[PDB]
């Protein structure tokens, strides 16, 4: 008697699926807290997320259902797909001396830097956010030239981007 | 005589570079548009770019220097650097039974579509912006999953999400 659980994303607002005609369906969150939904005559079932639960990604929801005899199914599961970029790194500013880029971006996301010409590079954050892309002794960053930053998650959502103008 | 121009991205804000001292620089753009700066006295210009003049990449410049004899330098041009992504996708509405998604984009932009369980399909926005892409048969589509769509234009350049719920 297992319900079905429709994929969810980390954009979703609500859990929806199958389960016996007018059970309760039951959807525990990892943080502990619950959210219910009552299938209706054809077992179509949603549940609405908790404003209170941020799903980001990865995370293993449990679906159950329980008859009006109190005969609950084994539970289903639930994994959600990271949809959601990560908000736009910080750039801290950067002199026409510089040798290296550095910032804030979500941990562990791919920063990608393009130089004002097009061309690009790249660093990665660590657990804590903080990234370092090393500028090559061979780009020459000038006054007044833009520079554009975004970060990616390893799913392959990309933020907006940050500019900043080099001093 | 020509002056240098520094390389100027689609969301620069000023163009800079070296021309003779105390010249009066002259930034023409495609549109006819014309911006001045005067180079100090070591050389360096910068120009504001006219908030009206928006640069979205490909554009060429030309830069002159004229003294105050009114001798003009030989031009130099810059082809404008594409860093600026599109506007979020606009996505009409999506039922279960739908075999197709269709909205509005930037004009020769990639729409990618992630369904809830993380795979894509694909398509090209037409010269009205129009796009419309077939889902895949293998693909079920279920009321309260969440869809997303974002832009991409040839530089790379990712839009903002833009999301909708399955009806
Ligand atoms: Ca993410
Ligand atoms: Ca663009």
Redesign the interface.
């Known amino acids: 008697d297992a319900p079905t659980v429709?994929?969810?994303?980390s954009?979703?607002?609500?859990?929806?699926?199958q389960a016996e005609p007018n059970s309760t369906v039951k959807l525990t969150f990892p943080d502990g807290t619950t959210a219910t939904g009552t299938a209706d005559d054809q077992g179509?079932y949603?549940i609405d997320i908790p404003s209170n639960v941020d799903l980001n990604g990865g995370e293993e929801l449990q679906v159950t259902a329980t008859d009006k005899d109190g005969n609950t199914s084994e539970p289903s599961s639930a994994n959600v797909?990271d949809?959601?970029?990560p908000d736009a790194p910080t750039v801290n500013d950067v002199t026409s001396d510089a040798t290296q880029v550095t910032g804030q971006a979500e941990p562990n996301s791919t920063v990608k830097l393009?130089?004002?010409?097009?061309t690009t590079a790249t660093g990665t954050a660590d657990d804590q956010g903080n990234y370092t892309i090393d500028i090559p002794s061979n780009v020459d960053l000038?006054?007044?030239?833009?520079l554009?930053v975004t970060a990616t998650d390893k799913?392959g959502?990309?933020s907006?981007?940050t500019?900043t103008?080099i001093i």
């Open positions: 429709n994929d969810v994303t954009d979703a607002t609500q859990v929806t699926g179509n949603t797909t949809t959601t970029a393009t130089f004002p010409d097009g000038n006054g007044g030239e833009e554009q799913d959502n990309t907006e981007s500019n103008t």
